[PDB]
Amino acid sequence: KEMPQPKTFGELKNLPLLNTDKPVQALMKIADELGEIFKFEAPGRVTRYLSSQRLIKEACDESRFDKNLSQALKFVRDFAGDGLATSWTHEKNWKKAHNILLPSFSQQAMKGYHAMMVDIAVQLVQKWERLNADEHIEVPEDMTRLTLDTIGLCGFNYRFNSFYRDQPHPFITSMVRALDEAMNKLQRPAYDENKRQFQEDIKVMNDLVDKIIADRKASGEQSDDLLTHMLNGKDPETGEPLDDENIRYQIITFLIAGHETTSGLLSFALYFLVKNPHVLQKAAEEAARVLVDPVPSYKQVKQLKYVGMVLNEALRLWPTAPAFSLYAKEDTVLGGEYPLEKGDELMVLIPQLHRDKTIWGDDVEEFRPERFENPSAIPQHAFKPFGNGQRACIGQQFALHEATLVLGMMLKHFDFEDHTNYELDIKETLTLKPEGFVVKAKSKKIPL
Amino acid sequence: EMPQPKTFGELKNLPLLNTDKPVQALMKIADELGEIFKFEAPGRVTRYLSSQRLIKEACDESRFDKNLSQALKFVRDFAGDGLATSWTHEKNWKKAHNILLPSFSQQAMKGYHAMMVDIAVQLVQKWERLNADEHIEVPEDMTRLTLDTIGLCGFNYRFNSFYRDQPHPFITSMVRALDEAMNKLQRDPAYDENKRQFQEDIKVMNDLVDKIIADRKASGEQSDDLLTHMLNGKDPETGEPLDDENIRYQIITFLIAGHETTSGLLSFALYFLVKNPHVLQKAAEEAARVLVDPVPSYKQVKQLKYVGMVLNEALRLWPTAPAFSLYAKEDTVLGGEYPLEKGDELMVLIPQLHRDKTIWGDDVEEFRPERFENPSAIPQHAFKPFGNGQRACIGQQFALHEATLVLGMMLKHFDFEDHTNYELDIKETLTLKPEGFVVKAKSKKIPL
C-alpha cells in the first residue's frame, strides 16, 4: 500500500541518485533493496520503477497503459523527431509510419536484406582473418562498426565504410555526440558550446540524410532498402505516404535505435560464450553443422536454433535497451494495492524483470540458453527485451537476424580466447555494453 | 502449366471427393502438388489455392468476387438468399449486409453478452454436476452451447439443449438438411427417399422460424436479439426493411453458419490445450486472474488476451469453415503464370494457407499461441479463418466473444484431463470437428 522509496537529498528528492556513471545498475541495486516497485521523485517529476513479472504483466495491458516518452526519449526526439521511437501513439505520423514500415521489417522482408547483411558480416570476418598473431579484437568497437554499416546499407543503401576507418564517418561522430549530449542532459552559460555543437551535429545528420533522399528521388533508382519502401509506401488507413522530413527521421531513428542495441547484444553474447566454454562449444557445433556453404543463406540462419537461444539469454541478462516508460490511460489500480491516477508514469526496469526468481528460478544469474527451448513454458510478459505491444521494437526481426547471422559466422570461422580474463564492466549510454571487452581469435582456416 | 491429381476416366477428378474426409484429402493433394492445382469434374473446373502468394491476389476484390461453391448452392435450398448463400450482386445481400453489420459489431456484443453467459453457465453447471470418473463429450457439449446461444441471441428462443439427449426437432432437421447437402456433393432412382426427407426438414425449419417471427410481430415485444433488430432495421441505401421471408433465411443462416464452426473451434482449442500443458497453464492463469467475479463481464472477456491467442492458433491449424470460393470478375493473370478467363472459379484451401512455411516458418504444425502475441506480425492475407473482404464472416466478433467467454470460464472452473490420450480424428461435415474427443474435468469448486 505504502510504496517504497530510496534515500532523498532534501529539495532534490531522489534525483541525485541518477547523477552517476552507471544509472541502470544503480536502479537495479535499489530494486534489490526495495523490491518490485519503488517511487522515484525529482523536482517536477514522479515515476515508479517496476521490477517483477507480477506487476509488469499488468503494465503491459495496452487497454490500461500506453507508451510514455521518458526524459531520455524526449531529449533524443530533438534529432529523431517524430520517427517511430520518439513519437507518441496519438501522433498521426506514428500510426502512419507504423502501418507503412511493418511489412518492411517482417521476417519475410529479412530475405531481402540478407545479402546486404552478409556483405558487412564478411567484412568483419575478413578483418579478423587478416589480423597478425597475438593481435586482439576490440569486441564492442568491431560490433558497432558491423551494425552501423549494416543499417546504413539496409536502411538507405549507404556505405559508412566503418571497416576502412579509425575515425568514423562524420555522421556517426555527430550521432554519437548527439546521443551523449542527450544522455548528459539527464544527470545535468558554459553549456553554450554543447548546444552549439548539438545544433551542429543535428545539421550534419539532417544534411546527409536529406541529401540521400533527394539524390534517390532525383535518380529514380530502386533498391532493396528501407528508403525505397518509404518513398513508395502508402499508409493503408489514411492513404498517405510519409513526407520526406519524416522519412529522414525514420532513417536517423533506425541508426539510433538499432546500431548500439544490436552491437551490445553481439558483444554481451560473445562475452557470455567465452565465459561459458560448454555453451560456446554447443553453439560452435551448431554453427559448423548448419553453415555448410561459404556464405550463409537466409534459410540457414533460421536453422541456428541454439545461437538464437544464446542471443535471447544474453538479452535476458543484459537487455541493451534496458527500460521503457508507460503512462496510465485512466485511473487504475496496479497489483491490487497501488492506485494510480490517469497520466501517472511507470518505468519498466527490464534487467530486474529478467532476474525475477519467481519466474526463472534461483540460478537467475547463470547463463543458460536452455531456458528458451519452449516460449510456451515462459509466463506472459516475463521477457521483454523488445518492449511491448504495438509500441514494441519494429526492428526485432532485423536485429535477431543480423545477430544470429553474425554470431553464427563468427562461431564457424574462429576459436575465441578470453586472453585477459576480462572483468565485466558495463558502460551505460542510452544502451549497455561490455566496455573494454577484448578477445583473441584463432582462425579455423575455413574459406569464404 | 497447372498440376492436377489423378483421374478416373470420364469422372476426371470427382471421385477424389468421394471420401469421408475431403478437406484433409485436398490438403494431402496440395502437399504433393504445391500452391495451386486444377480439379476437374463433368461440367466443372476449379482450382485449389494454398499459398499466401496466390491467395492474396484472389482476395483482391477488384479482381475476384465471392462464388457460391457447390456446397453453398446446396445449402441455399434452405438458407435461401440469406447472407452466406447469396451473390454479391443480388439486392438482398447488400440490403441485409447494411442492416445487419451494426448488430454484429464489437460494440454490439455488449447486448448479446448476458444471453451468452446464460448458456455458458448452463454448460459450467452441467460439468459441475458430473459424477466422479464420468467424462465430457466435448464437441457434443460445445454444439449444445453454440446452438442454444445462437437461438437465444438470434431470436430469443430456447432450444434447451442441455435438457435433452435428442435435440429439438429444428436442430435434428437442420443437421439432417446439412448432411443431405454435403452428401449431394460426393453423389439413381433410390434417392427418392432422400429428397422427400430433405423437403420435410426444410418445412420444419421454415415453420418454426416463420412462427416465431409471426409471434413476435403480433406481440410487439422488444428483445436484445437479432430478430428485433431485423424487424426494426432499415437499409440506409434502399430505405427498405428486410421482409419476413428474408428475415427467416437470415435466422436459419446464423444457425447454419455459426453453430458448428464455433463449436468446432471450442473443441479444437480444448484439444490443443490438453495436448500442450504449458499452454493450458498459461491460459488458465489468465482466466483466474481476469475472471474475478462469479459472472464474467463484457470488459473482462476482452482482457482474456492469451485465451484469444489460443483461439487464433486453433483457428490457424483447423479453420472450421475450411474453404471459400471466388470467381474472376474479368480476364486476369494469377501469379504471373496462370491466366484465367472471366467466370473462372477458385477455391481457397484455408488449412493449407495457414501452413504456408514462407509466412509462418518451419514449425507450422506446432500449436504455439505465441505466434499471435502481437497481431502486427501477421502478414496481409496469411490468416483468413473468417474469409475475405466485404464477404467475410459477419459473425466474427460474435464467434470470438462467445469462444473467449466460454473457454475462459472452462479454464477458470476446471482442471482438464486427457484421460484416454485422445488420438485426433477429424470428422468432416460442412465444417471440421475432432470426433470422439473426450475429457475428464475436475472442478476447482469456484462458485458462480
Ligand code: HEM
Ligand atoms: C538487440 C537489439 C534491439 C533491442 C534490444 C531493441 C529494443 C527496443 C525497445 C525496448 C523498444 C521499445 C522502446 C520504448 O518502448 O520506449 C524498441 C523500439 C523500437 N526499435 Fe528496437 N531494439 C533493437 C534493435 C533495433 C533495430 C535494429 C532497429 C531498426 C532497424 C530498431 C528500431 C526500433 C524502432 C523504430 C522502435 C520504435 C517502434 C515504435 O514505437 O513504433 N530496434 N526497440
Ligand code: HEM
Ligand atoms: C469460429 C466460428 C466461425 C468461422 C470460422 C466462420 C467462418 C466464415 C467464413 C470463412 C465465411 C466466408 C464464407 C465464404 O466466403 O463463402 C463466413 C461467412 C459468414 N458467416 Fe461465419 N464463421 C464463424 C461463425 C459465425 C457465426 C457465429 C455467425 C452468426 C452469428 C456467422 C455468420 C456468417 C455469415 C452470415 C456469413 C456470410 C456473410 C456475408 O457473406 O455477408 N459465422 N464465416
